[PDB]
């Protein structure tokens, strides 16, 4: 019964035009195997697009837009059809004019369109949707705010390329309020949108900080739902890729104790992101490395370095290694790391199959040795305590083998460690290793 | 301070 419907939708009688649009909208709503393909191939999209113009009944506009939305929320190719019919600008102008039911349809449509790819995202923005979308967050209608937030986050999503910052940054003031919503889905989507916005240059991080977002985000790290934790954690982590002052705002908002909580999350990936986040704080200045230690984060970090999944261990190793940087100007830090038992896990990690981490791990071990060496030379002792700890943990053997690694920098640092801190007993090797090695 | 994440991802639709 479809070629009939296609003709009833062409009738100049406004009465039949509606009846037809309504029948389309209904089959297009079937839960199981919607007939989106068949309806598209009957050529009726452009006809439905016309039914959304200003010069049309409020009741017809609704049904046409609802039908099209059902199409645009299908496959990437069925969304493409709706976009190629120039439906976006009419969806957009319906956000101003239309009633609330109509607004909710168009906002959902534009969300599905904006979420298909970075091109469609830019396209929605170029068609000046930002202005009307923001205007929706007055409605005090929970389901509409929920939807508008979902769409909003899709306009911010994507790093390569980033969206036009001068446009998407206009949403910061609204989001700043949205992360106070009591509707979980809203809250979640608002946090995603912030995680995307904060994921960029120092100018973007600063925008996030200047609307006072970071205070609230830190509070949200202890929300009961991991659906909130995740994006919130991520936004906070992105802020701390920034400079020392930026990082300091998040520490000042209470992020270290919240990170403590997350280092014992049931989800492995929350723990991984938490480690990453802490590692970017121990990459910070000496006060901040001390703040990390004062928040009792080292002990769980060390525990994860020994028993966590590999991806989590690498991130934890960064956190502990970055922290030993500050050990050359504050030797208390290294002493505390050592005493917390981080030597054996760092050593055991040298055999991981990742040269990026082996390097970081050797840098951490060198810093521990340099502090152990300056410790014994400062008080006329004849032994490097830290060197003996590394030796007794089978770390000497492991560092020794790193000289048989293909990366020249790894070999060179390992060679240096064996010569400097293990002098009489373990030879360093020079370059007859012309049959190279690694992978 | 030091390191971007491996991928922005942590996107709502793709993550875990």
Enumerate how many helices of chain A there are, as a single number. Answer: 29
Radius of gyration of chain A: 29 Å
When the domains of chain A are counted, the total is 1
Strand content of chain B: under 5%
Order of helices and strands of chain A: HHHHHHHHHHHHHHHHHHHHHHHHHHHHH
User: How far apart are the termini of chain A?
Assistant: 63 Å
- From the 3D coordinates, which CATH architecture of chain A would you assign? Alpha Horseshoe
Give the tally of β-strands of chain B.
0
DSSP helix fraction of chain A: 55-70%
Question: Largest contact between protein chains?
Answer: A-B, 33 and 12 residues
Shape of chain B: rod-shaped
CATH superfamily (homologous) name of chain A: Leucine-rich Repeat Variant
Overall geometry of chain A: elongated
Task: Return the structural class of chain A.
Answer: mainly alpha
CATH topology of chain A: Leucine-rich Repeat Variant
Percent of residues in helices of chain B comes to: under 10%
Pairing-aware structural class of the strands and helices of chain B? little secondary structure
β-strand amount of chain A: under 5%
Number of helices of chain B: 0
